[PDB]
Structure formats: C-alpha cells, structure tokens
C-alpha cells in the first residue's frame, strides 16, 4: 500500500501463472518444431529436376 | 492453525483453475511426446 498499487497481488499471481505457462509453451514449441513435418521434410512433394511421375 | 486464505470464496475456484491448468498441460505434453510422431 505504501509502494505497490491495489492490483499488485493479482498482477504478481498472474505473472507467476504466465511465467509457468510461458515455460510450458516454450518447451511445447521446441518439441513441436523438432517433430514438425517441415523440419523432418514429411508430406512435402520434394521437387526433382525431371519431375518423374511414380 | 488455519491457513491465511481460509474462508475465502475464491480458494476453491483458484484450486480448480490450478489443477485444470496442470491436467491440461500434462495431457498436452503427453500428446506431444507420445501421440504426435
């Protein structure tokens, strides 16, 4: 009350919650990127110099 | 002795919010690391 305003308690609790969610989202983004079809070149028609038709 | 927030009507909503966040994050991590491929 001397320094911090009224909503500082809710702001600090929401900051802890958002930091935990941000850590989880970063781990999730790293895992999805290392398992993604773009990274692993999956389900993409890789272009050939002749475009041979199987 | 009783806790600090004993008798507060927001305690069980915030406990359900924390447990819901934990189970959603756990299920999402399980999906990404086991059922994603």
């Amino acid at each position: 009350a001397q320094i911090f305003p009224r909503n500082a308690n809710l702001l600090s609790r929401l900051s802890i919650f958002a930091l935990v969610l941000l850590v989880v989202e970063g781990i999730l983004i790293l895992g999805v990127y290392f398992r993604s079809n773009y990274f692993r070149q999956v389900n993409v028609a890789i272009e050939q110099p002749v475009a041979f038709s199987h | 002795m009783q806790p600090e927030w004993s008798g507060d009507p927001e305690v069980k909503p915030v406990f359900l919010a924390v447990t819901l966040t934990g189970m959603v994050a756990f299920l999402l991590m399980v999906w990404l690391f086991a059922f994603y491929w």
Binding site: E25, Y33 | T21
Partner: peptide, 25 residues
C-alpha cells in the same frame, strides 16, 4: 482471481493447438 487464470489457460490452450496444427501443417 481464478477467472483470469481460466482466461490465460484458454489463451495458452488455443495458442498451443495452433502450434501443434502448424507442426502438422
């Protein structure tokens, strides 16, 4: 406030499903 926790969890869930779908894009 638990309602802001619920809204932040919903935002995190929506963004995570967008991330998963972009991984399977």
């Amino acid at each position: 406030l638990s309602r802001l926790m619920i809204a932040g969890l919903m935002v995190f869930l929506v963004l995570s499903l967008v991330v998963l779908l972009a991984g399977r894009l």
